[PDB]
Amino acid sequence: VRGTSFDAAATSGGSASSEKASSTSPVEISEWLDQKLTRPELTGAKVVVSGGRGLKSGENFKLLYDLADQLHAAVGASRAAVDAGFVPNDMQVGQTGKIVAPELYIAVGISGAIQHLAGMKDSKTIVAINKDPEAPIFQVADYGIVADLFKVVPEMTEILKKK
Amino acid sequence: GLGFSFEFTEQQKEFQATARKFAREEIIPVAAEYDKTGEYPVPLIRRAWELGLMNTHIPENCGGLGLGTFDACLISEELAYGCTGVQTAIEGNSLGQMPIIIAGNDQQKKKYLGRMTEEPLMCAYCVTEPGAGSDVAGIKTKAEKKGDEYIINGQKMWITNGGKANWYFLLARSDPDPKAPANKAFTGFIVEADTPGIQIGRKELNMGQRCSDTRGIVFEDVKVPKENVLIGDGAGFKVAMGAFDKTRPVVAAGAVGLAQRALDEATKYALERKTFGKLLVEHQAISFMLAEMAMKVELARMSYQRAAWEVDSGRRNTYYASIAKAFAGDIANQLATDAVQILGGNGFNTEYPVEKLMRDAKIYQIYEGTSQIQRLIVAREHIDKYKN
Ligand SMILES: Cc1cc2nc3c(=O)[nH]c(=O)nc-3n(C[C@H](O)[C@H](O)[C@H](O)COP(=O)(O)OP(=O)(O)OC[C@H]3O[C@@H](n4cnc5c(N)ncnc54)[C@H](O)[C@@H]3O)c2cc1C
Ligand SMILES: Cc1cc2nc3c(=O)[nH]c(=O)nc-3n(C[C@H](O)[C@H](O)[C@H](O)COP(=O)(O)OP(=O)(O)OC[C@H]3O[C@@H](n4cnc5c(N)ncnc54)[C@H](O)[C@@H]3O)c2cc1C
Ligand SMILES: Cc1cc2nc3c(=O)[nH]c(=O)nc-3n(C[C@H](O)[C@H](O)[C@H](O)COP(=O)(O)OP(=O)(O)OC[C@H]3O[C@@H](n4cnc5c(N)ncnc54)[C@H](O)[C@@H]3O)c2cc1C
Numbered sequence: 036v037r038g039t040s041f042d043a044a045a046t047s048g049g050s051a052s053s054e055k056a057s058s059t060s061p062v063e064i065s066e067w068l069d070q071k072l073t074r075p076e077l078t079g080a081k082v083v084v085s086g087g088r089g090l091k092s093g094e095n096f097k098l099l100y101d102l103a104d105q106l107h108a109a110v111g112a113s114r115a116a117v118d119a120g121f122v123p124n125d126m127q128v129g130q131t132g133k134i135v136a137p138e139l140y141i142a143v144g145i146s147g148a149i150q151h152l153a154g155m156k157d158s159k160t161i162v163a164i165n166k167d168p169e170a171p172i173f174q175v176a177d178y179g180i181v182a183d184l185f186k187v188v189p190e191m192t193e194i195l196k197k198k
Numbered sequence: 199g200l201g202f203s204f205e206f207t208e209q210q211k212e213f214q215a216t217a218r219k220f221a222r223e224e225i226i227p228v229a230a231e232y233d234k235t236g237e238y239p240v241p242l243i244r245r246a247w248e249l250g251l252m253n254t255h256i257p258e259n260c261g262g263l264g265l266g267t268f269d270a271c272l273i274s275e276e277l278a279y280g281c282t283g284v285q286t287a288i289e290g291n292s293l294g295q296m297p298i299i300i301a302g303n304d305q306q307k308k309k310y311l312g313r314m315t316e317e318p319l320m321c322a323y324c325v326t327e328p329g330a331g332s333d334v335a336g337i338k339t340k341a342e343k344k345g346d347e348y349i350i351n352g353q354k355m356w357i358t359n360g361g362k363a364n365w366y367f368l369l370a371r372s373d374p375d376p377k378a379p380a381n382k383a384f385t386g387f388i389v390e391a392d393t394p395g396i397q398i399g400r401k402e403l404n405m406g407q408r409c410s411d412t413r414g415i416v417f418e419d420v421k422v423p424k425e426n427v428l429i430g431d432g433a434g435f436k437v438a439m440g441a442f443d444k445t446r447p448v449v450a451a452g453a454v455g456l457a458q459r460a461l462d463e464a465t466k467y468a469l470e471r472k473t474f475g476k477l478l479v480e481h482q483a484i485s486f487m488l489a490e491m492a493m494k495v496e497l498a499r500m501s502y503q504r505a506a507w508e509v510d511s512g513r514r515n516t517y518y519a520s521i522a523k524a525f526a527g528d529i530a531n532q533l534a535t536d537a538v539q540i541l542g543g544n545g546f547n548t549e550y551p552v553e554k555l556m557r558d559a560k561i562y563q564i565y566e567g568t569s570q571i572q573r574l575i576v577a578r579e580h581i582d583k584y585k586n
């Protein structure tokens with residue numbers, strides 16, 4: 036069952052009897068040995084966050100990291116966020132930058148010019164937080180809100196500290 | 199009146215010789231360096247200003263010469279022959295100026311046209327956006343009236359002289375209702391480049407006219423005084439529309455200048471390069487090519503002349519300017535590639551003049567309205583003669 040095709044039923048709510056399960060004989064043709072668990076590189080990833088010119092500075096991108104550790108996620112940007120001094124060049128998603136298409140793409144303060152849509156309209160799922168309502172980015176985003184990003188984003192990093 | 203004439207006014211023969219001498223003694227010698235480097239040709243622009251080959255539409259009472267569209271076409275053909283990158287940078291000024299000329303008040307014209315009279319300042323036409331060029335009516339740059347000002351929010355694309363300009367003519371969306379028509383939705387502003395909020399983008403790298411600067415410009419909370427709106431709120435789309443009557447022919451003259459350069463090059467060379475015992479021009483196929491190329495140029499020339507004559511006569515010339523920009527642009531490309539062709543391997547080579555003319559020319563079928571757009575206009579104009 037695809038997880039995000041259904042809703043998590045209430046963790047509390049009903050109460051349920053618990054019986055001992057029936058037994059098996061150890062088979063021992065396989066044995067577990069070891070493990071190793073894990074902010075990705077941008078292109079290989081499955082969860083990308085990106086900020087446009089609407090963040091206004093590079094020290095302002097802390098809010099996008101804040102969240103791209105909650106989504107153990109990658110951090111890209113538009114060419115207009117790069118150009119304004121905010122971030123270096125190896126992160127620019129788009130036509131002149133790294134073509135990406137992971138599971139989850141967040142566009143934060145991105146107007147959504149055809150040149151930036153060309154670097155990511157193939158992301159499986161696309162998020163759009165942008166205060167202007169007639170902002171090209173909405174067409175291509177499965178999901179989005181007509182809202183200030185400094186209120187909506189630090190509010191999202193606080194709905195995934197717990198869940 | 200009298201019948202037809204295809205004879206220049208003496209005065210226009212004088213304008214012609216000045217532009218030519220400039221184009222030929224000053225541009226030609228240096229266009230391939232400025233093309234190789236993308237360096238903005240500041241000396242040549244200052245020298246063309248010096249010589250009064252620039253800002254020529256400005257009316258006399260703002261310190262200009264108040265020349266016509268025919269006069270302006272002569273001069274461009276001449277500059278364009280030398281270099282289209284240079285001539286485009288000169289020309290941009292007229293495009294920026296034109297809505298202020300055709301639609302500005304006395305304070306607006308005197309102030310903003312007038313300053314162009316006393317220093318070689320540049321101005322730019324700020325319309326095209328990442329998402330809309332052909333479909334002007336698709337632009338979304340916001341203007342909200344807040345006080346006795348407007349606040350401009352938007353991004354602009356492919357702005358010639360965009361990072362060299364004292365001020366801009368800017369077209370913006372005044373009416374939030376998306377159902378609002380183009381005749382109501384847009385307002386045109388005069389905006390000074392040095393306003394806080396305005397961020398000039400990087401120099402954009404194109405195939406052609408490389409010395410011309412063309413740039414993205416972003417407006418972030420840009421404060422625009424009520425007195426810099428053109429006719430009023432909602433007149434923007436008519437005002438931008440109207441600039442074209444006076445400007446299409448001149449870009450058509452540009453395409454013709456480059457066309458003529460291509461021809462002259464390819465002819466010179468076909469009078470010295472021989473193959474199979476004879477000169478190129480004695481091979482019939484080459485000769486036919488030069489012939490068709492000469493037709494094409496003569497016909498383009500008349501076409502833009504005709505457009506320009508129409509508007510100087512106080513007629514609206516939409517139909518004729520559109521034929522000019524369609525025909526001139528299509529044949530400038532045709533002539534450029536032929537010129538290469540005729541120079542064989544040398545023509546493809548960078549130490550010969552022609553490959554550039556080929557890289558330069560393609561833009562003529564794109565900007566100041568695509569080849570396709572021009573046909574839609576011509577079609578619409580043509581067909582209306584038959585609706586009764
Ligand atoms: C040849 C060429 C290639 C290009 N290649 C690329 C490419 O590779 N990648 C790329 O990104 N661009 C590229 N561009 C540029 C592209 O056309 C646009 O400049 C770019 O997509 C816009 O960047 P942006 O969305 O970050 O900035 P803007 O378009 O200015 O977007 C800012 C947005 O932020 C919003 N905003 C502002 N404040 C807030 C707030 N606090 N809360 C919520 N929203 C807010 C605004 O409403 C606006 O919509 C290219 C351009 C050219 C000419
Ligand atoms: C070098 C350069 C300098 C420029 N300088 C300026 C300037 O300073 N000021 C300014 O405002 N703009 C400037 N521009 C923008 C330029 O005017 C536009 O690119 C042009 O007007 C149309 O461009 P577009 O890219 O939006 O074409 P698109 O709208 O993307 O059209 C692409 C293609 O589709 C065709 N097409 C579109 N719609 C139709 C339709 N309805 N029917 C049939 N065919 C259609 C077009 O013919 C074209 O071939 C400049 C552009 C360049 C390349
Ligand atoms: C990128 C490049 C790579 C090349 N690589 C090689 C290679 O590896 N090996 C090699 O040997 N060569 C190579 N060449 C040379 C190329 O093969 C020749 O340029 C080509 O054969 C044309 O010859 P030309 O340049 O001397 O032009 P010309 O022979 O001077 O022809 C000039 C023009 O007149 C036309 N013309 C000539 N004669 C006639 C005629 N009889 N009737 C009608 N028209 C005529 C031609 O079509 C052309 O348009 C290369 C060239 C280039 C540009």
